[PDB]
Amino acid sequence: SKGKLGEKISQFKIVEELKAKGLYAYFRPIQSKQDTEVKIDGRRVLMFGSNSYLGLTTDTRIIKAAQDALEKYGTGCAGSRFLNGTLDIHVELEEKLSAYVGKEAAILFSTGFQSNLGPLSCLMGRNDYILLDERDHASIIDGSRLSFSKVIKYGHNNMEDLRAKLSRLPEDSAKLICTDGIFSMEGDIVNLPELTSIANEFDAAVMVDDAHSLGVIGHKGAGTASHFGLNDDVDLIMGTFSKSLASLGGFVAGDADVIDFLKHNARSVMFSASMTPASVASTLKALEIIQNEPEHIEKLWKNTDYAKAQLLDHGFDLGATESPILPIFIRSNEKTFWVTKMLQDDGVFVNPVVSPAVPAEESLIRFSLMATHTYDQIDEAIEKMVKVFKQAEV
Amino acid sequence: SKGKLGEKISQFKIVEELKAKGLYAYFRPIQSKQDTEVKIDGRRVLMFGSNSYLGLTTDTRIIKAAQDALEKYGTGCAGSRFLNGTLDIHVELEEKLSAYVGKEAAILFSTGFQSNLGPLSCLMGRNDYILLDERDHASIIDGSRLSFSKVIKYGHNNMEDLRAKLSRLPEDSAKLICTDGIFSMEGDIVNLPELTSIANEFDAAVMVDDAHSLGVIGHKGAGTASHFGLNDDVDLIMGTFSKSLASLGGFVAGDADVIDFLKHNARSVMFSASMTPASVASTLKALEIIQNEPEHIEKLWKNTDYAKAQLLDHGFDLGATESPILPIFIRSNEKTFWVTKMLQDDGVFVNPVVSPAVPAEESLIRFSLMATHTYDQIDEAIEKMVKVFKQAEV
Ligand SMILES: Cc1ncc(COP(=O)(O)O)c(CN[C@@H](CO)C(=O)O)c1O
Ligand SMILES: Cc1ncc(COP(=O)(O)O)c(CN[C@@H](CO)C(=O)O)c1O
């Protein structure tokens, strides 16, 4: 029945208002492969709103590995990994990820989102604590809500606040600190050296979400612990396959005893169907390309350094990025929606960040680089951004 | 750091003990396509532990639709549907599901699990209520924990307990009842006529999880509301693609205003990468086969009726199934593990249900049918089960 349900959704008017004003630019229906240019409404649009940092979703080798796994294994496994949904190729990918991030063992999940739900829901229980950076990804907040532990947020990269909040907790309790590695909003890196120093002093477990770090920082792209030399001080390395690795799924890697506990206790792996064969094979062949062909990471950072220097030279107000995510502050929700749509209508795709996710005065667009971008495409996007920011009077 | 974390996992000894006793049969590594026979350790094993009710993960048409979508769209969309991860083919699949289940609109999710997280996390809030059948799938319990509402369980298919618990709640609050359609443990069907009668009297919203119902019950497999004629009395129809539809992902269908709210407010769709192109295309072509070729549903039910009658004729103690899930009670955790491994070692794959998920005296194996099973394969599995149950002295 719908009376009360209709009242619950009655106040949600922003989408209706964006559509009516001709500003709506969510769920834009792309008609072609994710690439540096995409087709939308039959026209070609420069893609600066992707997470495909290495441009690998179009690599013919990765496509053919996926098509070959469909031929051999079919369209799906039709069960959880726990029961009838494990393939030899899942186990292979776990072994190859464990080697890549320097851990004993790993467990796959069908999404990156579920990869955070698993360890955060089942390791800390009644009378324990989870400590979260306040800017952690939604999946980490949600995984923490699924625990029976007390969840405590600390100020963004605020090591004194983390240390003070830990200090206060009962000694006779377990604690787990979970942080993004690269934070996607502003593209900043966690202070892993200080965080791990604090964790060691309070015997707290450390879990890093390397969604935006794998294929981006660390030796041969191995992530945030690799970037800082702190493999031994991070208990759990989580990553996703939906970004540099051009696929869908994720994993958690760590000590074999912890991973054995997770794979038999995490509801998001016991009660959800396994990764498709095609995604296991695409992730495996992306992982072998990222390591064997250093040119992809190198070109990503050439593009990042070039675009960042060009945006600063034009006087754009950038956030504190240390990644291929270039956050461009606008500081008005209305202007952020207008700039986003004006750019779309001039063939440039960027992602808006608005209220209620952030305060109006912190609203921005996110301009992300791919290894496969050209300097010409970067130049075209930035000269269109200059024109739209003028038209908008930012 | 690992001291307290090592203490948290220290008491989890069942896996170690199963492995040491040679009884371990989780994460069995299959080397071939999910089918009526699978390869494990190089040998052929009859598969009676699948959710692929129509056997479609091996259909060459579905494989080629998936391979063709890889060719056109690549290995992944590298973003949430909300931003850069929508394709024209996602929108097509939403329209074709909305038509199939008789609703205005649908939103896809990358997993079935996330499809329950979305509506259960974001529709009922502070001062509202979610009412859950106590046997609801883990994803429904978890999605309810992510809400800010008060979650109330009611006794399994206990309409007097549902009615009494609703009765007691403040009139000036929203309520949402969420139930499995087919419950996978025992394969029983929700009392949707009485549940919807109660929901109408208390103006509670109704959400049905048709994971095990789509492709199984309802006209041309359209699910539990279709099975009872109660499309108008169910607000939200949720389903998965990982079972009859041979793929990965899921959806929620309903009124366009509710679906528009969900797709812009459900964290599991705003903050998780979209379905791979290959899975959208496999789901689309499975959906067209289920409707156009009635032989698949018909053969599933021939196999189900034949196996059920054969198990009852041999004197197995079956649960109250109304589906192709045949629960065979053993009522001893030790015997359930032994029977499971003895069957595996004789080339028969079934799924155990044990403590702590159920009480020892309710432990069982689940024997599920596929349309593609033959009566010969059913006969071989049941004659092996008879032999193992004797050897085990059940
Ligand atoms: C009623 C119901 N609702 C939701 C889901 C989650 O769907 P997914 O496995 O496609 O994520 C399942 C999963 N069921 C399987 C995994 O596919 C299990 O082993 O639990 C389910 O049975
Ligand atoms: C830090 C971090 N951790 C986890 C995830 C979830 O991974 P998934 O998108 O592969 O499920 C994301 C997703 N990030 C994208 C979707 O891919 C977003 O729009 O939110 C993430 O940024």
Instruction: Encode B104-156 in three state secondary structure.
Output: CEEEEECCHHHHHHHHHHHCCCCCCEEEEECCCCHHHHHHHHHCCCEEEEECC
d(CA A198, CA A188): 20
Residue B221: left (phi > 0), alpha (psi -120 to 50), or beta? left
Q: What backbone torsions phi and psi does residue B369 show, to the nearest 5 degrees?
A: -95, 150
Q: Is the distance from CB of A71 to CB of B57 less than 8 angstroms? A: no
Name all contacts of A223-227 with Cβ < 8 Å and 24+ positions apart.
Answer: A223/A101, A223/A181, A224/A181, A224/A182, A224/A189, A224/A190, A224/A192, A225/A101, A225/A102, A225/A192, A226/A101, A226/A102, A227/A181, A227/A189, A227/A192
- Which three-class secondary structure state does DSSP give residue A252? strand
- Tokens representing residue A115 in the block: 């990869």
Spot the catalytic one: B110, B184, B279, B368. B184
- Chain A 344-373, residues with CB within 8 Å of chain B CB atoms: 349, 351
For ligand 1, atom 18: residue with the closest CA: A271
- Percent helix, strand, coil in chain B, to 5, is 45, 15, 35
Angstrom distance (rounded) from CA A94 to CA B97: 34
Please give the single-letter amino acid code of residue B158: N
Instruction: Check: CB of residue A227 under 8 Å from CB of residue A213.
Output: yes
Residue whose pair of structure tokens reads 């879990």 in the numeric block: A207
Mind giving me the DSSP string for A126-193? TT-EEEEETT--HHHHHHHHHSSSEEEEE-TT-HHHHHHHHHHS-SSS-EEEEEESB-TTT--B--HH
Per-state percent for chain A, helix, strand, coil, to nearest 5: 45, 15, 35
Compare CB distances from B27 to A81, A204, A275 and report the shortest one's residue.
A81
Q: For residue A359, give Cα distances in angstroms to A24, A116, A259, A331, B355.
A: 20, 26, 39, 8, 48
Catalytic residue among B227, B243, B285, B299: B243
Q: What is the 3-state secondary structure (H, E, C) of A14-41?
A: HHHHHHHHCCCCCCCCECCCCCCEEEEC
Burial (CB count within 10 angstroms: exposed 0-12, middle 13-18, buried 19+), residue B150: middle
Q: What are the angstrom distances between the C-alpha of A125 and each of A40, A104, A137, A139, A146? A: 47, 24, 21, 18, 10
> In this complex, is the C-beta atom of A15 within 8 Å of any C-beta atom belonging to chain B?
yes
Strand B105-109 vs strand A364-368: parallel, antiparallel, or unpaired?
A: unpaired
- Interchain contact, B33 vs A125, CB within 8 Å: no
Query: In which residue are the tokens 């680089």 written?
Result: A369
Interface test with B, best of A5, A90, A111, A271 (most B CBs within 10 A): A5
In angstroms, rounded to a whole number, what is the distance separating the alpha carbons of residues B193 and B178? 14
Q: Tokens 């900043």 correspond to what residue?
A: A188
Among the residues of B221-332, which ranges form H helices? 224-228, 256-265, 267-270, 277-292, 295-313
CA distance A336 to B76: 27
Q: Give the number of C-alpha atoms closer than 13 A to the C-alpha of residue B306, restricted to the C-beta side.
A: 18
**B174 → chain A, closest CA residue:** A4
Helices then strands, each counted (H, E), chain A = 15, 13
Task: Give residue B308's identity as a one-letter amino acid code.
Answer: K
Would you say B229 and B258 are in contact if contact means Cβ atoms under 8 Å apart? Answer: no
Q: Do B33 and A200 touch (CB under 8 A)?
A: no
Contacts of B332-339 with C-beta under 8 Å, sequence gap 24+, read B332/B360, B332/B363, B332/B394, B333/B360, B333/B363, B335/B363, B335/B392, B335/B394, B336/B363, B336/B364, B336/B365, B337/B18, B337/B23, B337/B25, B338/B23, B338/B392, B339/B365, B339/B385, B339/B388, B339/B389, B339/B392, B339/B394
Q: What b-and-e string marks burial along A160-199, b requiring 16 or more CB atoms within 10 Å of the CB? A: ebbbebbeebeeeebbbbbbbbbbbbbbbbbbbeebbebb
Token look-up 């699990």 returns B113
Coil, strand or helix: which one is B28?
coil
- Element at A194 (helix H, strand E): helix A192-202
B39 catalytic, yes or no? no
Pairwise CA distance, residues A384 & A367, whole Å = 13
Tell me which residue of A310, A352, A335, A394 sits closest to A49, measured CA to CA: A352
Is A112 annotated to bind a ligand? Reply is: yes
CA A112 to chain centre: 8
Instruction: Kindly list the strands in the beta sheet with A37-40, ordered across the sheet, starting from the edge strand earlier in the chain.
Output: A37-40, A43-47, A348-349
Distance CA A128, CA B116 (A): 27
Is B204 in CB contact (< 8 Å) with chain A?
Answer: yes
Residue B140 and residue B132: Cα distance in Å, rounded? 8
Cβ atoms of B209 and B342 within 8 Å: the answer is no
**Chain A residues touching B120 at Cβ < 8 A:** none
The best mutation among B242, B251, B325 to test binding of ligand 1, ranked by most ligand atoms within 8 Å of the C-beta, falls on: B242
Contact between A388 and A339 under an 8 Å Cβ cutoff? The reply is yes
Q: Look up tokens 């041969």; give the residue.
A: A220
Residues in chain B: 394
Residue B334: other Cβ atoms inside 10 A: 14
Q: Please state, as a whole number, how many other Cβ atoms lie within 10 Å of the Cβ of residue A127.
A: 12
* Phi, psi angle pair for B193, to nearest 5°: -60, -50
Token pair listed for B283: 């789901």
Catalytic residues of A: 184, 212, 243
Give the residue from A59, A325, A311, A377 showing the smallest Cα distance to A217: A325
Residue type, A273: A
Does the beta-carbon distance from B86 to A204 stay under 8 Å? no
Report which of A222, A213, A234, A238 is spatially closest to residue A106, judged by C-alpha positions: A238
The alpha carbon of A214 is separated from its chain's Cα centroid by a whole number of angstroms, namely 10
Buried b (16+ CB within 10 A) or exposed e, B270-303: bbbbbbbbbbbbbbbbbbebbbeeeebbebbbeb
Alpha carbon of residue B41 to chain centroid: 28
Nearest Cα to Cα of residue B329 among B246, B245, B385: B385
Token pair for residue B249? 């992902």
Of residues A9, A66, A83, nearest to B351 (C-beta): A83
CB A218 within 8 A of CB A225: yes
For residue A290, what are the contacts with CB-CB under 8 A and spacing of at least 6? A54, A56, A215, A220, A221, A244, A245, A296, A297
Q: How far apart are CA B35 and CA B53, in angstroms?
A: 10
Q: Pick from B183, B262, B182, B185: which is nearest to B215 by CA?
A: B182
Ligand 2 in contact with A249 (CB < 6 A)? Answer: no
Tokens of B250: 């899921």
Residues 6+ apart with CB under 8 A from A41: none
Round to whole Å and give the CA distance between B342 and B39. Answer: 17
Residue B113 labelled as part of a binding site: yes
Query: Could you tell me whether strands B37-40 and B150-154 are parallel, antiparallel, or unpaired per DSSP bridges?
Result: unpaired
Q: How many CB atoms lie within 10 A of CB B329?
A: 18
Q: Which of B75, B77, B267, B272 should be mutated for ligand 2, with most atoms under 8 A from CB?
A: B272
B90, B137, B175, B212: the catalytic one is B212
- Which string of DSSP letters, residue by residue, matches A288-318? HHHHH-THHHHHHHHHHHHHHHHHHHTT--B
Phi-psi region of A22 (alpha: psi -120 to 50; beta: other; left: phi over 0): left
Q: Which of A187, A128, A131, A130 is nearest to A159 (CA)?
A: A131
The interface residues of chain A toward chain B in range 49-78, judged by CB-CB distance below 8 A, are 49-52, 56-59, 62-63, 66-67, 70-78
Query: How far apart are the C-alpha atoms of B247 and B285, rounded to whole Å?
Result: 10
Q: Let me know: does A185 contact A352? Beta carbons within 8 Å.
A: no
User: What is the structure's resolution, reported in angstroms to one decimal?
Assistant: 1.5
Distance CA B129, CA B174 (A): 6
Q: Tell me if A111 CB under 6 Å of ligand 2.
A: yes
In sequence order, what are the residues at sequence separation of 6 or more whose Cβ sits closer than 8 angstroms to the Cβ of residue A75? A276, A277, A278, B56, B57, B59, B62, B63, B66, B246, B247, B278, B279, B282, B286
Name A375's Cβ contacts closer than 8 Å, sequence gap at least 6.
A303, A306
Q: Is the CB of B272 under 6 A from ligand 2?
A: yes
Dihedral sign for Cα atoms in the order B139, B141, B144, B145? negative
The answer to whether B212 is a known ligand-binding residue is yes
Tokens at A8, concatenated: 């619950």
Per-residue exposure over B228-238, b if at least 16 CB sit within 10 Å of its own CB, e if not: bebeebbbbbb
Residue of B nearest to A279 (CA): B75
**A87 CB within 8 Å of a chain B CB:** yes
Closest B-chain CA to A370: B78
Shortest Cα distance, chain B CAs vs residue A298, angstroms: 20
Q: Which atom of ligand 1 is nearest to the CA of B51?
A: 17
From CA B151, how far away is CA B130, in angstroms rounded?
Answer: 5
β-bridge pairing B175-180 and B205-209: parallel
Residue B309 at interface with chain A, using a CB cutoff of 8 Å? no
State the number of CA atoms in the 13 A half-sphere of B267 facing the CB. 18
Measured in angstroms, how far is the CA atom of residue A40 from the centroid of ligand 1?
Answer: 34
Residues 6+ apart with CB under 8 A from B353: B185, B327, B336, B362, B363, B364, B365, B366
- CB of A282 closer than 8 Å to CB of A249: no
**Residue A318 to chain B, least CA–CA distance (Å):** 21
Query: Chain B 131-160, CB below 8 Å of chain A: which residues?
Result: 137-139, 142, 145-146
d(CA B275, CA B77): 8
In angstroms, rounded to a whole number, what is the distance separating the alpha carbons of residues A186 and A39? 28
